[PDB]
Amino acid sequence: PEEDILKYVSYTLLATTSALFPFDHEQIQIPSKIPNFESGLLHLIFEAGLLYQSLGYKVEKFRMLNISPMKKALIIEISEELQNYTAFVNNLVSSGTVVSLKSLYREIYENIIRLRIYCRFTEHLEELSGDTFLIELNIFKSHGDLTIRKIATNLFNSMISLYYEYLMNWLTKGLLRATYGEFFIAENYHIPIEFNQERVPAFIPKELAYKIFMIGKSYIFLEKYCKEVQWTN
Amino acid sequence: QEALVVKDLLNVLIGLEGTYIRYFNDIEFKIAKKMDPSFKTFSRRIVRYGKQYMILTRAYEKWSDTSFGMVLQRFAYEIRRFLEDVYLKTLVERLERDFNKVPNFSIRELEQIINETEVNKQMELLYNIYEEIFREIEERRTKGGAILKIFQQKILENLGDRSSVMFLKKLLNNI
Amino acid sequence: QEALVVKDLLNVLIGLEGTYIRYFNDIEFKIAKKMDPSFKTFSRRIVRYGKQYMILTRAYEKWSDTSFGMVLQRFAYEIRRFLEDVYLKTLVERLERDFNKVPNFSIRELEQIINETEVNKQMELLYNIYEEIFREIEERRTKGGAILKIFQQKILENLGDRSSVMFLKKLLNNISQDYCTMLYEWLTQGILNDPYQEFMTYDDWDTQYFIRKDVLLRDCDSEEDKNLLFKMLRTGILLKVVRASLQIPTIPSNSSDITIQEINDFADLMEGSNLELYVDKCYSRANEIFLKLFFQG
Structure with a gap:
């Protein structure tokens, strides 16, 4: 009955249960046919289905318009990865040969590995809010393995761009945005603007950052002095 | 069985109106659901896309018909x-x-x-x-x-x- | 009878788990044996292959999951x-x-x-x-x-x-590639690399470095082996000090002995002699540059 079982299974990996699987807000609680042979395959499938259900759960959660652009950058990267899966699903279909459950596992190993790592980051992130995401990004980036390290690098590139934007604001128009508790400039009759030295990163050196702080600060201050400042420059 | 479902699926997906697919003036159009657990779940996600497409067209008429808000129209026509x-x-x-x-x-x-x-x-x-x-x-x-x-x-x-x-x-920019 | 045995054989060979095939947490999975003397003997040899396949997967998880040993992982993922x-x-x-x-x-x-x-x-x-x-x-x-x-x-x-x-x-070779990059980082730019340590020198104003004895590598112990190592180390310290010299910026880019070192990183290095020949060459250049820097400028 393998072909029928395969169409049910194919649908199952997408996170939609079949008439012979009791997958709900939970795994396959039992298989409706009980052989050991099926059961052993079933253990590896159950883990697989669980993860699909989790990813969807997480995605939905972050799509509730909650924290950082740092966070956003991550949603975009995960969202990219689900494209690969889809590609795999047409590719399995495209085969045109009878594909076994045994076969299904072998062909899609690589996604089990990448996907599982991405959950590790996600669990730790549940705690973290703001600038802590940046420390976690730094450590992760240091870890080797070509693929793992490669994913980590991609996340770094989209973030560094968020920083460049904040910097750009600061250096040219004395403007700065700290949003959910990242960067390092804090406000505070009081009305001052100043550097949070513990939050200055040393990735881009602290010393380097300190000079930058003085320069942005100086620009805003000049504007307040007189509207007409050194322009075209 | 399976063949029937896919032929039925194609027909559903275009999202034609009818007597079998009934109209509530404000949820909107709704039809009875009764599918395989697999298909039924996919059909729920899909229902969301379709709903926006229909809402959007509705939205569009409102913003441009003989409305006021020059700006308001100018956006709406271009987006539609x-x-x-x-x-x-x-x-x-x-x-x-x-x-x-x-x-x-x-x-x-x-x-x-x-x-x-x-x-x-x-x-x-x-x-x-x-x-x-x-x-x-x-x-x-x-x-x-x-x-x-x-x-x-x-x-x-x-x-x-x-x-x-x-x-x-x-x-x-255009606006 | 015979037909039944072969159908039963195919099923056994894939080595599926179950309730009939029971689990001992550490022999592993074992199942009752009860076959023809002919088949039973073949099934024993076969049992050995299967056991390794299962052990290997187990081994694999251990070495890579969220382990430490950068090197250790790098091998494990590739082999799996x-x-x-x-x-x-x-x-x-x-x-x-x-x-x-x-x-x-x-x-x-x-x-x-x-x-x-x-x-x-x-x-x-x-x-x-x-x-x-x-x-x-x-x-x-x-x-x-x-x-x-x-x-x-x-x-x-x-x-x-x-x-x-x-x-x-x-x-x-691939594993040597990591080694070659850290060596290369050091010899060309005075920087070691440590996720969770990958050298036996750890950094202790201006800083110092020393060797943490407990972990200390097997390869470099003997009096003679250590003296030779000290001289190798001494080139490495000189290189880290050249990096400190970025007070007046230095990013090495001057025409040096660079090409040779880049080839060497690619090479796969597992030779004491070739490498030491290389460090001498690098050292001489590092000292000459240090000197040139000091003496004028």
């Missing part, structure tokens, strides 16, 4: 024309390839691609707008710089996604 | 991916041909071929590793150069079998 061109081309081509090969063929790969581009731009726009329309009834009960401002807030939430801000910026 | 590709293709194709023709067909020819390639590479690796893991628990109760050394010993036992040494050398 762009969404129509992308959707129409893509969809048409897709239904024909699926029918042509064998009388039905699977949606899902086709849908994923089309879905990302479409979903993101349209949804975001209409959601803000729905809140603002509500707000206007509330102001009336108890503008220019505000439209620019609202657009500015929207870019600012958007920041860090290339695609979105580029589209939005282009509409901003 | 290679064994999976060969086994998966081969096996799948084989079960389908056997089922397809007639509902069962004989294993043995198929098995012999697959068996040689698989058996030799995987088994040897895991056996050394099992001993080393045990040894680590024993050290802890009562590193880098040691991993290279252990690999070197393994090539040396292997010698005279083309297949084995070629595979092993290829894994060595």
Whole structure:
């Protein structure tokens, strides 16, 4: 009955249960046919289905318009990865040969590995809010393995761009945005603007950052002095 | 059984109206559900895309018919024309390839691609707008710089996604 | 009777788990045996292959999950991916041909071929590793150069079998690539690399570095071996001090001995002599540059 079982299974990996699987807000609680042979395959499938259900759960959660652009950058990267899966699903279909459950596992190993790592980051992130995401990004980036390290690098590139934007604001128009508790400039009759030295990163050196702080600060201050400042420059 | 379901699926997906698919004036059109657990779940996600497409057209009439708000129209006509061109081309081509090969063929790969581009731009726009329309009834009960401002807030939430801000910026520009 | 046995055989061979095939947490999975004397004997040999396949996967999780030992992982991921590709293709194709023709067909020819390639590479690796893991628990109760050394010993036992040494050398090479990058970082730009340490020098205003004795590598112990190492270290310290000299910026880019070093990083380095020849060359340049910097400018 393998072909029928395969169409049910194919649908199952997408996170939609079949008439012979009791997958709900939970795994396959039992298989409706009980052989050991099926059961052993079933253990590896159950883990697989669980993860699909989790990813969807997480995605939905972050799509509730909650924290950082740092966070956003991550949603975009995960969202990219689900494209690969889809590609795999047409590719399995495209085969045109009878594909076994045994076969299904072998062909899609690589996604089990990448996907599982991405959950590790996600669990730790549940705690973290703001600038802590940046420390976690730094450590992760240091870890080797070509693929793992490669994913980590991609996340770094989209973030560094968020920083460049904040910097750009600061250096040219004395403007700065700290949003959910990242960067390092804090406000505070009081009305001052100043550097949070513990939050200055040393990735881009602290010393380097300190000079930058003085320069942005100086620009805003000049504007307040007189509207007409050194322009075209 | 299976064959029947896929032929039934193609027909559902175009989202034609009828007597079997009934109308509630405000949920909107709704039809009875009764499918395989597999198909039924997919059909729920799908239901969301379709609902927006229908809401959008509705929204569109309102904003441009013989409305006031010169600016308001100018945006609406441009957005309706762009969404129509992308959707129409893509969809048409897709239904024909699926029918042509064998009388039905699977949606899902086709849908994923089309879905990302479409979903993101349209949804975001209409959601803000729905809140603002509500707000206007509330102001009336108890503008220019505000439209620019609202657009500015929207870019600012958007920041860090290339695609979105580029589209939005282009509409901003014309306006 | 005979038909039944072959259908039962195919099913056994894939090595599915179950309730009939029970689990002992550590022998592993075991099932009751009760076959023809002929089949039962073959089933015993076969049991050995299967046991390794299962042990290997287990081994694999351990070495890579969220482990430490950058090097340790890097090997494990690569080996798991290679064994999976060969086994998966081969096996799948084989079960389908056997089922397809007639509902069962004989294993043995198929098995012999697959068996040689698989058996030799995987088994040897895991056996050394099992001993080393045990040894680590024993050290802890009562590193880098040691991993290279252990690999070197393994090539040396292997010698005279083309297949084995070629595979092993290829894994060595990739692993050597990490080593070559850290060496390269140091010799050209005075920077070591440490995720969770990958050197036995740890940094203790202007800072210093020293060697943490407990972990200290197997490769460089003996009086003579250490003196030689000190001189190697001394070039390395000189290079880190040149990096400190970025008070007046230095990013090496002047025409030096650079090309040679870049080739060397690519090379796969496992030779004491070639490498030391290289450090001398690098050293001389590092000192000349230091001097030029000091003396004028």
